[PDB]
Amino acid sequence: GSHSMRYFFTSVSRPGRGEPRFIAVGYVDDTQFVRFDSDAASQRMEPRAPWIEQEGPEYWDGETRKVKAHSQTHRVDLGTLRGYYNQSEAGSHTVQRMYGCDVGSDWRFLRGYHQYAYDGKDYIALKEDLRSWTAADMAAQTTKHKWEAAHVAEQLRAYLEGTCVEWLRRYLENGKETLQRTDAPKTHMTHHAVSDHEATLRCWALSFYPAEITLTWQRDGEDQTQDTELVETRPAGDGTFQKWAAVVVPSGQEQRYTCHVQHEGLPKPLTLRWE
């Protein structure tokens, strides 16, 4: 299946005193493998997965050097943006950045990305063709003109199609024991009487990986959304994910309902029906 590598960066200004809070995390698919927190004592890029600990000293020194350079750019950006939007220096603001690459099922470059946000809203993003920019407003337009003249897209395209893909493949191999393994959801159903004539059926999907999944309820072979509830997919905390979907039904009619589970770790979708 396809795979991806992504880096997330968040910088929060602190007008009261000192420098912005900077936090960066790296991910391969749904597995975090590195992080950097300006508030931490190491002041170094740190491992968050066993398979990346294999990397030698030159790796960590290079990554640390580069991530620090990123925080400084963000620090500068927070100031530049404050001016563009003509904002006070007393309020705290946020700059976020995300970039990375995807490899298709053929393990070749599929797509790349590089987007930026200010105070939780799109600011500027590299288009899919990795040659043009999408600017949300006139502040972002000035940035766009500057990056076009400096040919920033060309430099990024080189990384996204080359370096990015090359390292993603390296990580996929080094951590193949987990990164290239799918964990099928473990499923079961619970029953809870809410009244003398009504009962709730909850369909559970546990300890699965990756996070992508679909849970659907059917009544007599027909999809049902009325009287149902599905919670957002949530992390179990051990690297896997969880989710459930519930439906309220007439006591005694539980057998008409079936829960359908689709996940790439499943050869065919699962179908559950209450006892």
Binding site: T80, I124, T143, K146, Q155, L156, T163
Partner: peptide, 9 residues
């Protein structure tokens, strides 16, 4: 592996 150069806004 992180990108090398980072252009400012």
């Amino acid at each position: 592996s992180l990108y090398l150069t980072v252009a400012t806004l």
